[PDB]
């Protein structure tokens, strides 16, 4: 009844909530400036992040045209964790450009020179800039590129007197409820009105925009909600399997069912829609024994998957789930290094021996140890998005 309002109530927070604790342990805790640049973790790409606060006056993140086939992207995620911008080559090709991120109810006239505009509906946004780098040599030169990223406020850009950045005093986590901090970060912004429909349901609750006083019966609903909300989505996790329904935009997500919306949260914060990102991982091989380096040789053999960028395969130690040391300091295998068979097939052969396989590409070295691999999609098709696609299989060689 009003148990259940309350479970509803907090499976809604719970994404605003944990992007605000995010946030909390990293940037307010470690003092990180706002609009400045600052396992399992990507072979294939370079980064920048940092955190944009459009409060006082929108802000614009300066890229440049990069060079011809170098991937590329410039995300941004709000505090409901919405993906709210995806400038990447994947769309626009070399083609950087002035990128400016202004509150939903910002009012002012865009300078000529930006080239477009992302309204924002929390003031703060996470910021991750992805730049591919292939070998040691190239992530040089697109360390040249990064440089030339640059995050500037609008009166900074129009070499003007603007107005003084805000100042927030931040709820602490540890000894706060989850109520006052979703309330403190639906204040920050436009989220009130983007999430009206949610919002006109969980009134009662307490939940509502620079709310502080409540009632004993709102805050015991508060507990109970979370402990019931919690226990639902540990429930509901491993029945997820299309990516679609967890990561995206508030064009595509904002009216879908929250704890379904909250296990992207869950599963994978700060994630990629799929269109942009998706992946797979294996853990076994095709018989169903833990892949271990120490205990077998393995092949992986597949038509290339229809991705309209690249793909790769990552090798992670099941122990620190970490990349593992190897002479050949390979870690990975994708179309970027490798070439398709005379019938497109590719092969990729595993094993700790790699004595006499540098001169061989499709050769991915393996630890002597349980292990993992990860494969990524960029500018994956439908089928790969949304689960469907099955993760090419691992086979034990003689």
Known sequence: TNVDLAEDAYIYGYSIDEAYKFFYHTAVE?????????????????????????????????????????????????????????????????????????????????????????????????????????????????????????????????????PKPVQRTYPDPKKSTWLERVNFVLCDGSMGNADKQWLDKYQSIGVE???????????????????????????????????????????????????????????????????????????????????????????????APNVSEFWSVTIYGNDNRLMAKNDLNRHSRGDRTMKADKDGYYTIYMSANEKGRADDPNFLPVPEKPFYAIMRFYGADDAIQSGEYQMPEIKVVK
């Open 209 to 303: 925009p620079c709310k502080t006083d409540f009632t004993p019966e709102q805050l015991k609903l508060a507990k109970v909600g979370e402990k019931k909300g919690m226990e639902h989505l540990v429930e509901l996790a491993p029945k997820m399997t299309d990516a679609r329904t967890l990561l995206g935009t508030r064009d595509t997500l904002g009216d879908a069912p929250r704890d379904i919306f909250a296990e992207g949260t869950y599963l994978g914060q700060w994630g990629l829609p799929p269109i942009e990102a998706s992946y797979r991982k294996s853990d076994f091989d095709s018989i169903g024994q833990k892949l271990d380096g120490s205990k077998h040789d393995y092949v992986m053999r597949f038509k």
């Open 30 to 162: 470690n003092n990180y400036p706002l609009n400045e640049f600052q396992p399992t973790i990507n072979n294939d790409t370079l980064h920048l992040m940092g955190w944009l606060d459009v409060a006082a006056e929108p802000v614009i993140v300066s890229v440049p045209d990069m060079d011809e086939g170098r991937y590329w992207i410039l995300h941004t995620m709000d505090m409901g964790h919405y993906t709210n911008a995806a400038f990447s080559s994947r769309t626009r090709g070399t083609k950087g450009g002035q990128f400016m991120f202004a509150a939903q109810d910002w009012q002012g006239e865009v300078p000529a020179s930006v080239d477009e505009v992302v309204r924002v509906d929390s003031n703060l946004v996470k910021l991750m800039g992805r730049i591919m780098a292939v070998n040691d040599e190239d992530a040089k030169v697109a360390l040249n590129y990064m440089d030339q990223w640059n995050i500037r406020t609008l009166s900074e850009y129009l070499g003007k007197n603007g």
